[PDB]
């Protein structure tokens, strides 16, 4: 009755939920509505929606999409955010004529600033993956924006706890797979996975057998094969090694990654060589995520 009174829904943008473009009619302004069907939810999932709404109002950062309204109706809940109009970063990269380590580094720098902000606010995302990395607009030099904090949790300082088995198979951290207490480091692991894909166009851990995948993640069994990693700077590999560290107490933090020479000295450390095989391989990677 009441949401349909104020917003008009148009096309679908993505999918847990669906996200549709809406217009707030009488204000003549557009947003993205994350629309959750609340029948397909337990008592605990309803309570987690109130936490999701809470978390999203806390976060004010240029690299995080902002929440504008939270409306619950008969069967549904509506979270109304800023509309960002450039689509996935990963889909944008493949349409570019030039793509280098310097571009990867600037993307990761923006992501890490988003993640530092979350961590400073006591918020751990838990599910960072390509799907959450949107572009503010179609304009050149648009900001990378984090969208969707559906699995995000609130942490108490630097305390670790067993918050549940949650996340996406290829980006899951060893500590979560071992069923160990976890916290902020889970997000840095996921960033290492994202940085690896950004450099070569394929993921560090992959197996058609999920149980084997999990054993690979838990062992830290990734490598940098020739020929394609031969033209990657040692400092990009070094950053990846420090994010994909199996022991979360030893893993690099967001604050530390932002001071890493490949990030903070991008302009004199990151390669500017076009990586055409990354572009081509990422197109294939994207196609598999959509299939
Ligand atoms: O503008 C947007 N504000 C948001 C707030 C939360 C979640 C998604 C979006 C979003 C999106 N805007 C656009 C524009 C073009 C293509 C996709 C797309 C979006 N989201 O896509 C779905 C991804 C997300 O649901 C995965 O967790």
Numbering used by the authors: -5 to 0, 13 to 21, 24 to 299
What's the paper's own text on this?
Calcium/Calmodulin (Ca2+/CaM)-dependent serine/threonine kinases (CaMKs) constitute a family of 81 proteins in the human proteome that play a central role in cellular signaling by transmitting Ca2+ signals. The N-terminal kinase domain is tethered via an autoinhibitory helix and a calmodulin binding site to a C-terminal oligomerization domain that organizes the enzyme into ring-shaped oligomers.
To address this, we determined the structures of all human CaMKII isozymes in their autoinhibited state. However, the autoinhibitory helices in all isozymes were structured only up to residue 302. Different crystal forms were observed, containing one (CaMKIIγ), two (CaMKIIα and CaMKIIδ), or four molecules (CaMKIIβ) in the asymmetric unit. However, no indication of a conserved dimer interface was evident within the crystals with packing contact regions typically involving small and diverse surface areas. All four CaMKII isozymes were crystallized with ATP-competitive inhibitors that are relatively non-selective.
